[PDB]
Scaffold this active site. Structure first.
Site, mmCIF file in Angstrom:
data_model
loop_
_atom_site.group_PDB
_atom_site.id
_atom_site.type_symbol
_atom_site.label_atom_id
_atom_site.label_comp_id
_atom_site.label_asym_id
_atom_site.label_seq_id
_atom_site.Cartn_x
_atom_site.Cartn_y
_atom_site.Cartn_z
ATOM 1 N N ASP A 255 2.096 1.703 7.947
ATOM 2 C CA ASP A 255 0.466 1.631 7.105
ATOM 3 C C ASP A 255 1.402 0.264 6.370
ATOM 4 O O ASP A 255 0.579 0.377 5.252
ATOM 5 C CB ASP A 255 -0.459 2.338 6.762
ATOM 6 C CG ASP A 255 -1.216 1.536 6.533
ATOM 7 O OD1 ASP A 255 -1.130 0.318 7.060
ATOM 8 O OD2 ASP A 255 -2.483 1.933 6.342
ATOM 9 N N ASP B 281 1.374 -1.194 -0.109
ATOM 10 C CA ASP B 281 0.213 -0.056 0.465
ATOM 11 C C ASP B 281 0.894 1.069 0.015
ATOM 12 O O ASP B 281 0.861 2.078 0.702
ATOM 13 C CB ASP B 281 -1.058 0.238 1.249
ATOM 14 C CG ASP B 281 -2.160 0.524 0.929
ATOM 15 O OD1 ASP B 281 -2.446 1.979 -0.208
ATOM 16 O OD2 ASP B 281 -3.303 0.309 2.249
#
Ligand code: NMY
Ligand code: GNP
Ligand code: MG
Ligand code: MG
EC number: 2.3.1.-
Length: 295
Positions: A210, A191
């Site tokens: 993340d 991501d």
């Protein structure tokens, strides 16, 4: 705002024995998670059992903090609570400024280069890890799509318009013919967009966050957003240069991979709606198909 915070403050103090919350604010949120900045010092990511979850993300931070040699900071989990109904991860906030198109456009050519090299170096080092110790964290994007397509056929496919069916079948025909899943597999962030990249006061890459979607997957995955042309990302040239610096990778295939994932986005949106029983996403995805068809 006021109420969400009180509840999470209660949960944090309840599950983490001697943790005292002096301050707490919402710092971000997904569609089924909420993140909090606590005591101006800790990030707490929280989720109430979805289709998850935070167990994998935790295993990844743990794997990486053991094995990465890098100056780039990543989350280091000090607190965790993981259950079917609730998950919480706590770690010290990485300090810095998130990369954006606006910021990038104010950097000197040299500053931009150094940032690009920093990114290529990080990805090179991560993609190069022996992933044996996290080998259960595999992700097959092609197979996932085939399963998602089957779910469509089992649920709403027969109620779609012809235009929508043609878009979906055309994508599947493309998925079947491509070779972009037959390449190198490795551990990817998965991501890797600029809203997860942190800069220090010299505009050098200081941290990354993340790793929640991370896994062992096609090497091409970590360039999908670097190659993206949109208001949120920097641009195709940025990703191209990074690919050159990274080396030993077919740039045209990385682009093909990115283009295929972009084509899939509306279908993915629809499938999320089905899986989570949210009509809103089903309609958004269907409408996006009409918008793409008429460009
Ligand atoms: N939150 C969803 C998580 O990430 C992915 O899904 C997301 C991904 O496909 C896509 O979103 C991605 C993000 O992700 C990524 N980190 C920034 C990027 N600009 C965004 O891109 C997407 O939305 C942009 C605007 N909005 C569009 O301009 C762009 O064309 C589109 N591909 O749409 C989904 C939600 O925005 C995984 N597929 C899913 O399994 C996981 O749970
Ligand atoms: N400055 C800073 N911000 C952070 C840090 N950790 C998380 N954030 C902030 O919190 C937001 C949400 O964190 P993130 O890991 O992206 O989670 P998410 O995508 O919202 N949730 P999920 O990964 O479950 O879909 C980020 O956009 C960023 O604002 C950190 O270490 N430093
Ligand atoms: Mg995020
Ligand atoms: Mg995430």
């Amino acid at each position: 705002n006021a109420t969400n915070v009180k509840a999470m403050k209660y949960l944090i103090e309840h599950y983490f024995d001697n943790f005292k919350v002096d301050s707490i604010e919402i710092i971000g949120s997904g569609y089924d998670s909420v993140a909090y900045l606590v005591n101006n010092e800790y990030i707490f990511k929280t989720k109430f059992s979805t289709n998850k979850g935070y167990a994998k993300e935790k295993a990844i931070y743990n794997f990486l903090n053991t094995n990465l040699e890098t100056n780039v900071k990543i989350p280091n989990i000090e607190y965790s609570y993981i259950s079917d109904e609730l998950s919480i991860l706590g770690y010290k906030e990485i300090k810095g400024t998130f990369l954006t198109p606006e910021i990038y456009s104010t950097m000197s050519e040299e500053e931009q280069n150094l940032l690009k090299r920093d990114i290529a170096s990080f990805l090179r080092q991560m993609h190069g890890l022996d992933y044996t110790d996290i080998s259960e964290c595999t992700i097959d994007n092609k197979q996932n799509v085939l399963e998602e397509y089957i779910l469509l056929r089992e649920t709403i496919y027969n109620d779609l318009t012809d235009i929508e069916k043609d878009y979906i079948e055309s994508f599947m025909e493309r998925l079947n013919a491509t070779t972009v899943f037959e390449g190198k597999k490795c551990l990817c962030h998965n991501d890797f967009s600029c809203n997860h990249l942190l800069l220090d006061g010299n505009n050098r890459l200081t941290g990354i966050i993340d790793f929640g979607d991370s896994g062992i997957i096609d090497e091409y995955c970590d360039f999908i957003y670097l190659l993206e042309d949109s208001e949120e990302e920097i641009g195709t040239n940025f990703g191209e240069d990074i690919l050159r610096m990274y080396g030993n990778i077919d740039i045209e295939k990385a682009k093909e991979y990115q283009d295929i994932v972009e084509e899939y986005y509306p279908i993915e949106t629809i499938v999320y709606g089905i899986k989570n029983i949210k009509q809103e996403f089903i309609e958004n995805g269907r409408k996006e198909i009409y918008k793409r068809t008429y460009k």
